[PDB]
Short mmCIF file of C-alpha atoms and ligand atoms in Angstrom, two decimals:
data_model
loop_
_atom_site.label_atom_id
_atom_site.label_comp_id
_atom_site.label_asym_id
_atom_site.label_seq_id
_atom_site.Cartn_x
_atom_site.Cartn_y
_atom_site.Cartn_z
CA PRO A 1 -12.99 -136.95 -129.60
CA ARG A 2 -13.80 -133.34 -129.08
CA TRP A 3 -12.39 -130.22 -127.35
CA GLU A 4 -13.47 -130.09 -123.70
CA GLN A 5 -13.02 -125.96 -124.25
CA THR A 6 -15.25 -123.79 -126.25
CA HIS A 7 -12.82 -120.88 -126.99
CA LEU A 8 -10.20 -122.42 -128.74
CA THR A 9 -6.99 -120.56 -130.37
CA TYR A 10 -5.59 -121.01 -134.00
CA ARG A 11 -2.30 -119.99 -135.51
CA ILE A 12 -1.06 -119.93 -139.44
CA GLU A 13 2.37 -121.14 -139.16
CA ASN A 14 3.60 -120.17 -142.95
CA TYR A 15 1.90 -119.34 -146.14
CA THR A 16 1.82 -120.64 -149.66
CA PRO A 17 3.36 -118.30 -152.16
CA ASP A 18 0.57 -118.94 -154.30
CA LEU A 19 -1.87 -116.35 -152.85
CA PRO A 20 -1.19 -113.00 -151.08
CA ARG A 21 -1.10 -113.38 -147.39
CA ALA A 22 -4.44 -111.38 -146.56
CA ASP A 23 -6.28 -114.07 -148.90
CA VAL A 24 -4.86 -116.75 -146.94
CA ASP A 25 -5.74 -115.41 -143.53
CA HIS A 26 -9.22 -114.62 -145.09
CA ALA A 27 -9.88 -118.09 -146.78
CA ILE A 28 -8.96 -119.53 -143.19
CA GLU A 29 -10.78 -116.88 -140.97
CA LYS A 30 -13.93 -117.54 -143.08
CA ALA A 31 -13.74 -121.37 -142.86
CA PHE A 32 -13.61 -120.91 -138.92
CA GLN A 33 -16.73 -118.76 -139.01
CA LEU A 34 -18.66 -121.08 -140.92
CA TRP A 35 -18.32 -123.59 -137.79
CA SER A 36 -18.84 -120.93 -135.12
CA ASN A 37 -22.04 -119.26 -136.99
CA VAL A 38 -23.71 -122.89 -135.55
CA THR A 39 -22.19 -123.79 -132.41
CA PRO A 40 -21.11 -121.97 -129.36
CA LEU A 41 -17.22 -122.36 -130.47
CA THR A 42 -15.29 -119.07 -130.66
CA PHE A 43 -11.97 -118.99 -132.25
CA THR A 44 -9.20 -116.65 -131.67
CA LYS A 45 -6.08 -116.31 -133.98
CA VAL A 46 -2.61 -115.97 -132.23
CA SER A 47 0.35 -114.53 -133.82
CA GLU A 48 3.09 -116.68 -131.69
CA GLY A 49 2.98 -119.35 -129.31
CA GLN A 50 1.43 -122.58 -129.42
CA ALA A 51 -2.24 -122.75 -130.35
CA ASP A 52 -5.19 -125.45 -130.28
CA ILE A 53 -5.05 -125.28 -133.98
CA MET A 54 -1.71 -124.97 -135.93
CA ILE A 55 -2.16 -124.65 -139.75
CA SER A 56 0.87 -125.09 -141.91
CA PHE A 57 1.71 -125.62 -145.79
CA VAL A 58 4.29 -128.50 -146.06
CA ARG A 59 5.17 -130.74 -148.82
CA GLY A 60 6.06 -134.43 -149.22
CA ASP A 61 7.63 -135.96 -145.84
CA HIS A 62 7.01 -133.41 -143.24
CA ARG A 63 7.69 -135.00 -139.89
CA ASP A 64 4.24 -136.52 -139.35
CA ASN A 65 3.21 -140.15 -140.36
CA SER A 66 1.37 -139.05 -143.64
CA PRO A 67 3.81 -137.73 -146.21
CA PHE A 68 2.13 -135.87 -149.00
CA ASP A 69 2.20 -137.00 -152.62
CA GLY A 70 3.02 -134.30 -154.88
CA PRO A 71 0.34 -132.46 -157.10
CA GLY A 72 -3.20 -134.04 -156.92
CA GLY A 73 -4.15 -136.98 -154.90
CA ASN A 74 -4.32 -135.97 -151.17
CA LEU A 75 -4.61 -132.24 -151.07
CA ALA A 76 -4.50 -131.71 -147.05
CA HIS A 77 -5.10 -133.68 -143.97
CA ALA A 78 -5.96 -132.80 -140.28
CA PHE A 79 -5.98 -134.32 -136.84
CA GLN A 80 -8.79 -134.85 -134.46
CA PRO A 81 -8.91 -132.85 -131.30
CA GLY A 82 -6.39 -134.12 -128.86
CA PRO A 83 -2.92 -132.95 -127.38
CA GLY A 84 0.26 -132.45 -129.24
CA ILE A 85 -0.59 -132.35 -132.98
CA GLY A 86 -4.47 -132.94 -132.20
CA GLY A 87 -6.37 -130.38 -134.03
CA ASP A 88 -3.43 -129.27 -136.74
CA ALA A 89 -4.44 -128.86 -140.07
CA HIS A 90 -1.48 -129.36 -143.11
CA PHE A 91 -2.02 -128.59 -146.66
CA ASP A 92 -0.02 -129.82 -149.27
CA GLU A 93 2.12 -127.01 -150.66
CA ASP A 94 2.59 -128.94 -154.02
CA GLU A 95 -0.93 -128.32 -154.86
CA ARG A 96 -2.06 -124.88 -156.63
CA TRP A 97 -4.02 -123.07 -154.23
CA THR A 98 -6.85 -120.64 -155.63
CA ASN A 99 -9.19 -118.04 -154.27
CA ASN A 100 -11.96 -118.96 -157.13
CA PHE A 101 -13.06 -121.76 -159.21
CA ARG A 102 -10.05 -122.78 -160.43
CA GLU A 103 -8.60 -126.15 -158.57
CA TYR A 104 -8.13 -126.26 -155.63
CA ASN A 105 -9.94 -123.51 -153.90
CA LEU A 106 -8.21 -123.07 -150.35
CA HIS A 107 -11.24 -121.91 -148.65
CA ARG A 108 -13.33 -124.87 -149.61
CA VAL A 109 -10.55 -127.19 -148.36
CA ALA A 110 -9.87 -125.44 -145.26
CA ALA A 111 -13.44 -125.67 -144.18
CA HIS A 112 -13.26 -129.49 -144.85
CA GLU A 113 -9.91 -129.88 -142.75
CA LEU A 114 -11.18 -127.77 -139.83
CA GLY A 115 -14.29 -130.02 -139.47
CA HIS A 116 -11.80 -132.76 -138.76
CA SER A 117 -9.97 -130.45 -136.10
CA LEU A 118 -13.06 -130.20 -134.61
CA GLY A 119 -14.04 -134.06 -134.47
CA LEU A 120 -15.76 -134.76 -137.65
CA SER A 121 -15.34 -137.77 -139.67
CA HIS A 122 -16.22 -138.12 -143.28
CA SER A 123 -19.88 -137.74 -144.72
CA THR A 124 -21.50 -139.81 -147.58
CA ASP A 125 -23.62 -136.97 -148.94
CA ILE A 126 -22.11 -135.38 -152.19
CA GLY A 127 -23.32 -131.90 -151.02
CA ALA A 128 -21.68 -131.88 -147.75
CA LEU A 129 -18.48 -130.27 -146.80
CA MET A 130 -17.10 -133.35 -145.21
CA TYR A 131 -17.43 -135.27 -148.29
CA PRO A 132 -14.03 -137.28 -149.02
CA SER A 133 -13.26 -135.97 -152.48
CA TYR A 134 -13.23 -132.40 -153.57
CA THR A 135 -16.21 -130.40 -154.63
CA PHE A 136 -16.59 -126.72 -155.41
CA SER A 137 -20.07 -125.02 -155.79
CA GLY A 138 -18.96 -121.23 -156.05
CA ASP A 139 -20.29 -120.56 -152.46
CA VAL A 140 -18.73 -122.58 -149.48
CA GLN A 141 -21.71 -123.17 -147.06
CA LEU A 142 -22.27 -125.96 -144.55
CA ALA A 143 -24.62 -128.59 -145.88
CA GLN A 144 -27.52 -129.93 -143.45
CA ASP A 145 -25.10 -133.34 -142.60
CA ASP A 146 -22.19 -130.71 -141.50
CA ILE A 147 -24.60 -128.83 -139.24
CA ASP A 148 -26.00 -132.04 -137.73
CA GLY A 149 -22.63 -133.55 -137.10
CA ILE A 150 -20.96 -130.67 -135.48
CA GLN A 151 -24.17 -129.61 -133.51
CA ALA A 152 -23.97 -133.34 -132.33
CA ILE A 153 -20.76 -132.42 -130.38
CA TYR A 154 -20.77 -129.05 -129.24
CA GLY A 155 -24.59 -128.20 -129.31
CA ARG A 156 -26.23 -125.20 -131.05
CA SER A 157 -25.52 -121.81 -130.90
C1 LIG B 1 -8.50 -134.02 -155.75
N1 LIG B 1 -8.27 -134.99 -154.48
C2 LIG B 1 -9.18 -135.34 -153.69
O1 LIG B 1 -10.48 -135.26 -154.00
C3 LIG B 1 -9.03 -136.65 -152.82
C4 LIG B 1 -9.57 -137.59 -152.88
C5 LIG B 1 -9.21 -138.31 -154.18
C6 LIG B 1 -7.64 -138.83 -154.21
C7 LIG B 1 -7.07 -139.37 -155.26
C8 LIG B 1 -7.97 -139.11 -156.69
C9 LIG B 1 -9.04 -138.84 -156.51
C10 LIG B 1 -9.64 -138.35 -155.61
N2 LIG B 1 -9.33 -136.03 -151.44
C11 LIG B 1 -8.54 -134.97 -150.61
O2 LIG B 1 -7.66 -134.73 -150.79
C12 LIG B 1 -9.33 -134.93 -149.21
C13 LIG B 1 -8.37 -135.86 -148.03
C14 LIG B 1 -9.00 -135.28 -146.83
O3 LIG B 1 -10.00 -136.08 -146.36
N3 LIG B 1 -8.45 -134.88 -145.58
O4 LIG B 1 -8.87 -134.38 -144.76
C15 LIG B 1 -9.58 -133.45 -148.91
C16 LIG B 1 -10.78 -132.77 -149.78
C17 LIG B 1 -12.10 -133.48 -149.52
C18 LIG B 1 -10.54 -131.36 -149.67
CA1 LIG B 2 -1.13 -133.83 -152.99
ZN1 LIG B 3 0.81 -133.81 -142.11
ZN1 LIG B 4 -11.07 -135.33 -145.05
#
């Protein structure tokens, strides 16, 4: 599954009160930048309307078939490209979201969920952003496995 268009939009529907709004926007815009730096994709943030990728902070049963589970456990989930909810990213509001090394760094999680929004599955490489359990090294960057995977779907910049 992949997006047919290379110019996509996203919208942050709501925000967690754990961080100032600017920090949430920054964390999300930098996560998209990681993926657009190695592919021909471009991302535009819209303030209203329906976007290709809708991001929201929600808790427990939130109208999809994957209810959240409170603090810890699953931290966020996303949907592969497609119509409707395809591409959407949901972050569990019951977690403590940070901008530093304390669990759990929003930018680090957003980088992994947007990989799913673009069509990636999980990696078996512990240094990869797409590994299935959270890791935080201090500096969020794509690993070779991450680069290889997204360029296999959209080509290289
Ligand atoms: C601290 N929680 C985790 O690391 C759990 C796995 C886990 C669950 C129970 C106990 C130990 C580990 N992983 C997730 O939340 C992932 C779910 C997911 O893949 N979304 O796309 C997202 C992270 C990789 C950012
Ligand atoms: Ca949780
Ligand atoms: Zn959800
Ligand atoms: Zn995942």
